[PDB]
Amino acid sequence: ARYTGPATRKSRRLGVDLVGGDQSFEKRPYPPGQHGRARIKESEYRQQLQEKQKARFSYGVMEKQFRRYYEEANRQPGKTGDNLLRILESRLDNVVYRAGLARTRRMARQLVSHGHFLVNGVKVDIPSYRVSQYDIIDVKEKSLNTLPFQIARETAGERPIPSWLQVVGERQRILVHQLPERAQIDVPLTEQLIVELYSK
Amino acid sequence: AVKIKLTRLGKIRNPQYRIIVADARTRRDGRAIEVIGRYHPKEEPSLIQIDSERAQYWLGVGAQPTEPVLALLKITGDWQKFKGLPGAEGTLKVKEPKPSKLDLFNAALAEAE
RNA sequence: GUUUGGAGAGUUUGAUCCUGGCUCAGGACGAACGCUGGCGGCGUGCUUAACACAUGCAAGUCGAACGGAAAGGCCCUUUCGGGGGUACUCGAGUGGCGAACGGGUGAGUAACACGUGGGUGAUCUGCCCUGCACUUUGGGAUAAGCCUGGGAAACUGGGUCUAAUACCGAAUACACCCUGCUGGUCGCAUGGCCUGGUAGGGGAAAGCUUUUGCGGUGUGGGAUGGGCCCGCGGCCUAUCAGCUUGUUGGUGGGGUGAUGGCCUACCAAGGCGACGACGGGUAGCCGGCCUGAGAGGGUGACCGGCCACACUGGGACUGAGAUACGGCCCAGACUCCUACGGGAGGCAGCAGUGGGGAAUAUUGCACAAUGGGCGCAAGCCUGAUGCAGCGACGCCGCGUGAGGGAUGACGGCCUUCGGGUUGUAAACCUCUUUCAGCACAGACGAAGCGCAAGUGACGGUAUGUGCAGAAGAAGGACCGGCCAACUACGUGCCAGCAGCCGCGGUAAUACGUAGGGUCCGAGCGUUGUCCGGAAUUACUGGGCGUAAAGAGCUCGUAGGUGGUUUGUCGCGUUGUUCGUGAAAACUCACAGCUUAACUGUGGGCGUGCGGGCGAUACGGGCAGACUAGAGUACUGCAG
Ligand SMILES: [Mg+2]
Ligand SMILES: [Mg+2]
Ligand SMILES: [Mg+2]
Ligand SMILES: [Mg+2]
Ligand SMILES: [Mg+2]
Ligand SMILES: [Mg+2]
Ligand SMILES: [Mg+2]
Ligand SMILES: [Mg+2]
Ligand SMILES: [Mg+2]
Ligand SMILES: [Mg+2]
Ligand SMILES: [Mg+2]
Ligand SMILES: [Mg+2]
Ligand SMILES: [Mg+2]
Ligand SMILES: [Mg+2]
Ligand SMILES: [Mg+2]
Ligand SMILES: [Mg+2]
Ligand SMILES: [Mg+2]
Ligand SMILES: [Mg+2]
Ligand SMILES: [Mg+2]
Ligand SMILES: [Mg+2]
Ligand SMILES: [Mg+2]
Ligand SMILES: [Mg+2]
Ligand SMILES: [Mg+2]
Ligand SMILES: [Mg+2]
Ligand SMILES: [Mg+2]
Ligand SMILES: [Mg+2]
Ligand SMILES: [Mg+2]
């Protein structure tokens, strides 16, 4: 399944920019609903939980799949928080967003899912597809002149492109030289709280 | 009689076979005396590997191949060798190794720059 | 050496600290139930009654063993009613091989059943492989056929007749089996080996085919599959203390493939037990699985290996091999047929029915692929198996749209009547059609099979290429504290809620509804069950003055434990190497499915056990030494 309800109310509850271009958040930075102004009792569990919610509602990953990501990250030899972040960064819908061909991670998901991209010459419509070193991502012929993709070509500049990604052509060809290290990744989140949440 | 059989591994619609030495009475997916090879028909060319040293021993002592295993032993030349007939070099085909991923990355770098 | 790995909260009191139980948050399932429900991939599905079973299938095959000629075919023949021949072919029958595998179930079993490691100088092994020798010679039958009898049926008798690779006598074998004598050698005592040498006696066979030609007998070795014995390991219960007389041992016979009270006659009086014998209860065991920081705890569904059984109980026969599921004989229960004399059955194979239960599927499609049986082979058989159908039963993946959109509509709900929430949400404006839908292409799995030249069950499925349009696609639980998420109204100790503490007594963040919110999402909750939290059986890792806990006090049996020092063994301990620890699983890496689940390949893991070799500090055994512990002697002393 996907979460398709209002997007602003999630950033408002969590008190941080998820889309990062959202005027309605800055207008009402408090949580939603009738009681969104009221004082909330502090607790360590709520802090840990909301960092997890920021991660999964930024990247658009359901709790089931996110928990599998955690176990893999913890199993991997690095430090769990770095591994978890770079696994979610390896997602193809995320790589497309980081490349700039999409406006929002929601838009990136739809594009990948609808079958507009190819990886190493083979069509992939799996948003959760994890890119690896030296993957090449291309756009199919039909979608190259496609009106929102045309917009994407001449709308370069919205955000910066990270060093591990590289767009090399006007064809909008994306190359991945390596998986991002924690320094490379730039996300508004404290990953150590999520590792602690799942150690409960 | 001790026979050389294919045992089925893999999942639905993906038959992968190990070449095993087993008593005729033993069920297909039962305990084997040795695994001496593997055979993957879903590939192109179908993947064939045989441990020729062990295949020669087992045929020497009198293991009887099954029909498909006999076809594979002829492709590998292990049958022709065991009998003394010519063709021991065999006509084994191997899948053309796909281009390395690093080289294709360099190709894309050069092409766009 | 070594980091990859441990979270807590509530509840005894006016308050406190401790002790201690109870309860909760996590994970898991062959699940069930409630609400809800789009698609696909890969798995999985009688846990109860080893209850009873309608119906169809689950084991046959060989004309290159044989007489034959019912069906086809061909050749005569015709009058067209039939009648011959052929043997390409083949019903029934004789004969060979298979039917002991494969599939099911877990009733029994606390046992060498199973796991792991050994032993066999105590043994068997059809078919297969590879040496050697041979395959001589006669004979008498019978099924089928034909005639006829008995019986309701199931079945069965007599006569006549025919064949073989069916059966039977003899020769040859001197490798082989038995006995006597006798030489060498190796050990582990019986013994083993040298096919030792030697004398005496003895042991087999089968033909067919004319083609890739298949067979027969003895014997040497191998391969495979077993049999039997032993060490060690894995349940509760002394409110179960004695049990055993073929029982423990011996000799002479018998028996088996083989050892052995396995059996038997005699002789000796033994054997097993608080390191729980004999009883009682429960249970198939394991690789593994679940949980856990680990140790441990729980568990044995699927998949894989052993074992056990096949309506209940007993028995043997055939065979290389038998718990003989779809064999036989007997007894019993039950169902059925009968002419009342007598007969016939066995789904714990696949599918299916009734029943029991909270609950578990189709009276599919193929032998195309892999494995198996027979056949020289073409081939035939195969409910093994490969697939399909059904059930969110589980795991994994994807969709139910994306961008923009205001000081922010209507409507709903709060209010300090200012407004504030729902909410960028919606409306609207453009943008993409994944998955479903409608067309047109269309597999891999088959270096296969037959070499006759056709051959894929799944399947016109998966997957590609076009078309139309946001178009068809969201629910469930929770919101007092644990524990994320609060207000209004309705009943006022009522109706009700609840895992625990506890909430309802006409102002409830706990009841019911609504608005809003939170956590999850094609699922969400509940019940049941196991581990965790629980250091709450504590080996890791707890205690006993007063919280639960020192026997009323001694003596002493088994057991446990052991001062200083020399030498020695190398049992414990430790190093190293080899063998083994099946596959799968697990884990690391890498690859293949669009990703994942899943699958494959290569390491590790498999903590163990066995063999060889090394060390001797420490524990222990063995042989000594010493006096500080312990005891004795002597001289005093108090009670
Ligand atoms: Mg899901
Ligand atoms: Mg059952
Ligand atoms: Mg016949
Ligand atoms: Mg059987
Ligand atoms: Mg004979
Ligand atoms: Mg004797
Ligand atoms: Mg039982
Ligand atoms: Mg623990
Ligand atoms: Mg016999
Ligand atoms: Mg039956
Ligand atoms: Mg039988
Ligand atoms: Mg059945
Ligand atoms: Mg019922
Ligand atoms: Mg076959
Ligand atoms: Mg053939
Ligand atoms: Mg049949
Ligand atoms: Mg809270
Ligand atoms: Mg414990
Ligand atoms: Mg508990
Ligand atoms: Mg205590
Ligand atoms: Mg004490
Ligand atoms: Mg007390
Ligand atoms: Mg006392
Ligand atoms: Mg003592
Ligand atoms: Mg000492
Ligand atoms: Mg002692
Ligand atoms: Mg293993």
Coordinates of all heavy atoms in Angstrom, one line a residue, chain C residues 99-104 309-310 322-325, ligand 4:
Chain C
rA99 P 10.3 -55.3 -6.2 OP1 11.0 -54.3 -5.3 OP2 10.7 -56.7 -6.0 O5' 8.7 -55.1 -6.0 C5' 8.1 -53.9 -6.3 C4' 6.6 -54.0 -6.4 O4' 6.3 -54.9 -7.6 C3' 5.8 -54.6 -5.3 O3' 5.4 -53.6 -4.4 C2' 4.6 -55.3 -6.0 O2' 3.6 -54.4 -6.4 C1' 5.3 -55.9 -7.2 N9 6.0 -57.2 -6.9 C8 7.3 -57.5 -7.1 N7 7.6 -58.7 -6.8 C5 6.3 -59.2 -6.4 C6 6.0 -60.5 -5.9 N6 6.8 -61.5 -5.8 N1 4.7 -60.7 -5.6 C2 3.8 -59.7 -5.7 N3 4.1 -58.5 -6.1 C4 5.3 -58.3 -6.5
rA100 P 5.0 -53.9 -2.8 OP1 3.9 -54.8 -2.8 OP2 4.9 -52.6 -2.2 O5' 6.3 -54.6 -2.2 C5' 7.6 -54.0 -2.3 C4' 8.2 -53.9 -1.0 O4' 8.5 -55.2 -0.4 C3' 9.6 -53.2 -1.0 O3' 9.8 -52.6 0.3 C2' 10.5 -54.3 -1.1 O2' 11.9 -54.1 -0.7 C1' 9.8 -55.4 -0.2 N9 10.1 -56.8 -0.5 C8 10.8 -57.7 0.3 N7 10.9 -58.9 -0.2 C5 10.3 -58.8 -1.4 C6 10.0 -59.7 -2.4 N6 10.4 -61.0 -2.4 N1 9.4 -59.3 -3.5 C2 9.0 -58.0 -3.6 N3 9.1 -57.0 -2.7 C4 9.8 -57.5 -1.6
rC101 P 9.3 -51.1 0.6 OP1 10.0 -50.7 1.9 OP2 7.9 -50.9 0.5 O5' 10.0 -50.2 -0.5 C5' 11.4 -50.1 -0.7 C4' 11.7 -49.4 -2.0 O4' 11.2 -50.2 -3.1 C3' 11.1 -48.0 -2.2 O3' 11.9 -47.0 -1.6 C2' 11.1 -47.9 -3.7 O2' 12.3 -47.6 -4.2 C1' 10.7 -49.3 -4.1 N1 9.3 -49.6 -4.3 C2 8.7 -49.1 -5.5 O2 9.4 -48.5 -6.3 N3 7.4 -49.4 -5.7 C4 6.7 -50.0 -4.8 N4 5.4 -50.2 -5.1 C5 7.2 -50.5 -3.6 C6 8.5 -50.2 -3.4
rG102 P 11.2 -45.9 -0.7 OP1 12.2 -44.9 -0.2 OP2 10.3 -46.6 0.4 O5' 10.2 -45.1 -1.7 C5' 10.7 -44.4 -2.7 C4' 9.6 -44.0 -3.7 O4' 9.1 -45.2 -4.3 C3' 8.4 -43.3 -3.1 O3' 8.6 -42.0 -2.9 C2' 7.3 -43.7 -4.1 O2' 7.4 -42.9 -5.3 C1' 7.7 -45.1 -4.5 N9 7.1 -46.1 -3.6 C8 7.5 -46.7 -2.5 N7 6.7 -47.5 -1.9 C5 5.6 -47.5 -2.8 C6 4.4 -48.3 -2.7 O6 4.1 -49.1 -1.9 N1 3.6 -48.0 -3.8 C2 3.9 -47.1 -4.8 N2 3.0 -47.0 -5.8 N3 5.0 -46.4 -4.9 C4 5.8 -46.7 -3.8
rG103 P 8.2 -41.3 -1.5 OP1 8.5 -39.8 -1.7 OP2 8.8 -42.0 -0.4 O5' 6.6 -41.4 -1.4 C5' 5.8 -40.6 -2.2 C4' 4.3 -40.9 -2.0 O4' 4.0 -42.3 -2.4 C3' 3.8 -40.8 -0.5 O3' 3.6 -39.5 -0.1 C2' 2.6 -41.7 -0.6 O2' 1.5 -41.0 -1.3 C1' 3.1 -42.8 -1.5 N9 3.7 -43.8 -0.7 C8 5.0 -44.2 -0.6 N7 5.3 -45.2 0.2 C5 4.0 -45.5 0.8 C6 3.7 -46.4 1.8 O6 4.4 -47.2 2.4 N1 2.3 -46.4 2.0 C2 1.4 -45.5 1.4 N2 0.1 -45.6 1.8 N3 1.7 -44.6 0.5 C4 3.1 -44.7 0.3
rG104 P 3.7 -39.1 1.4 OP1 3.4 -37.6 1.6 OP2 5.0 -39.6 2.0 O5' 2.5 -39.8 2.2 C5' 1.2 -39.6 1.8 C4' 0.3 -40.5 2.7 O4' 0.6 -41.9 2.5 C3' 0.3 -40.3 4.2 O3' -0.4 -39.2 4.6 C2' -0.2 -41.6 4.7 O2' -1.6 -41.7 4.7 C1' 0.4 -42.6 3.7 N9 1.7 -43.2 4.1 C8 2.9 -43.0 3.5 N7 3.9 -43.7 4.0 C5 3.3 -44.4 5.1 C6 3.8 -45.3 6.0 O6 5.0 -45.7 6.1 N1 2.8 -45.8 6.9 C2 1.5 -45.4 6.8 N2 0.7 -46.0 7.8 N3 1.0 -44.6 6.0 C4 1.9 -44.1 5.1
rC309 P 6.3 -52.7 13.2 OP1 6.3 -53.9 14.0 OP2 7.2 -52.6 12.0 O5' 4.8 -52.4 12.7 C5' 3.7 -52.3 13.7 C4' 2.6 -51.4 13.2 O4' 3.2 -50.1 12.9 C3' 1.9 -51.8 12.0 O3' 0.9 -52.8 12.3 C2' 1.3 -50.5 11.5 O2' 0.1 -50.2 12.2 C1' 2.4 -49.5 11.9 N1 3.4 -49.2 10.8 C2 3.0 -48.3 9.8 O2 1.9 -47.7 9.9 N3 3.8 -48.0 8.8 C4 5.0 -48.6 8.7 N4 5.8 -48.3 7.7 C5 5.4 -49.5 9.7 C6 4.6 -49.8 10.7
rA310 P 0.4 -53.9 11.2 OP1 -0.4 -54.9 11.9 OP2 1.6 -54.4 10.5 O5' -0.5 -53.1 10.2 C5' -1.7 -52.4 10.6 C4' -2.3 -51.6 9.5 O4' -1.3 -50.7 9.1 C3' -2.8 -52.4 8.3 O3' -4.0 -51.8 7.8 C2' -1.7 -52.1 7.3 O2' -2.1 -52.2 6.0 C1' -1.3 -50.7 7.7 N9 0.1 -50.3 7.2 C8 1.3 -50.9 7.6 N7 2.3 -50.3 7.0 C5 1.7 -49.4 6.1 C6 2.3 -48.5 5.2 N6 3.6 -48.4 5.0 N1 1.4 -47.7 4.5 C2 0.1 -47.8 4.7 N3 -0.5 -48.6 5.6 C4 0.4 -49.4 6.2
rA322 P 13.8 -60.1 4.6 OP1 14.1 -59.7 6.0 OP2 13.7 -61.6 4.3 O5' 12.4 -59.5 4.1 C5' 12.2 -58.1 4.4 C4' 10.7 -57.8 4.5 O4' 10.0 -58.1 3.3 C3' 10.0 -58.6 5.6 O3' 9.2 -57.7 6.3 C2' 9.2 -59.6 4.8 O2' 8.0 -60.0 5.5 C1' 8.9 -58.8 3.6 N9 8.5 -59.6 2.4 C8 8.7 -60.9 2.2 N7 8.3 -61.4 1.1 C5 7.7 -60.3 0.5 C6 7.1 -60.1 -0.8 N6 6.9 -61.1 -1.6 N1 6.6 -58.9 -1.1 C2 6.8 -57.9 -0.2 N3 7.4 -57.9 1.0 C4 7.8 -59.2 1.3
rU323 P 9.8 -56.6 7.4 OP1 10.3 -55.4 6.6 OP2 10.6 -57.3 8.3 O5' 8.5 -56.1 8.2 C5' 8.1 -56.7 9.4 C4' 6.8 -56.2 9.8 O4' 6.8 -54.8 10.0 C3' 5.6 -56.5 8.9 O3' 5.1 -57.8 9.0 C2' 4.6 -55.4 9.3 O2' 3.9 -55.8 10.4 C1' 5.5 -54.3 9.6 N1 5.7 -53.3 8.5 C2 4.6 -52.4 8.3 O2 3.6 -52.4 9.0 N3 4.8 -51.6 7.2 C4 5.9 -51.5 6.4 O4 5.9 -50.7 5.5 C5 7.0 -52.4 6.7 C6 6.8 -53.3 7.7
rA324 P 5.6 -59.0 8.1 OP1 4.6 -60.1 8.2 OP2 7.0 -59.3 8.4 O5' 5.5 -58.5 6.6 C5' 4.3 -58.0 6.0 C4' 4.5 -57.0 4.9 O4' 5.3 -57.6 3.8 C3' 3.3 -56.4 4.3 O3' 3.6 -55.2 3.7 C2' 3.0 -57.5 3.2 O2' 2.2 -57.0 2.2 C1' 4.4 -57.8 2.8 N9 4.5 -59.3 2.4 C8 5.1 -60.2 3.2 N7 5.1 -61.4 2.7 C5 4.5 -61.2 1.4 C6 4.3 -62.1 0.3 N6 4.5 -63.4 0.3 N1 3.7 -61.5 -0.8 C2 3.4 -60.2 -0.8 N3 3.6 -59.3 0.2 C4 4.2 -59.9 1.3
rC325 P 3.4 -53.8 4.6 OP1 4.2 -52.8 3.9 OP2 3.8 -54.1 6.0 O5' 1.9 -53.4 4.5 C5' 1.3 -53.3 3.2 C4' -0.1 -52.7 3.4 O4' 0.0 -51.2 3.6 C3' -1.0 -52.8 2.2 O3' -1.7 -54.1 2.1 C2' -2.0 -51.6 2.3 O2' -2.9 -51.9 3.3 C1' -1.0 -50.6 2.8 N1 -0.3 -49.8 1.7 C2 -1.1 -48.9 1.0 O2 -2.3 -48.7 1.2 N3 -0.5 -48.2 0.0 C4 0.8 -48.4 -0.3 N4 1.4 -47.7 -1.3 C5 1.6 -49.3 0.5 C6 1.0 -50.0 1.5
Ligands
MG4 MG 6.3 -50.6 2.0

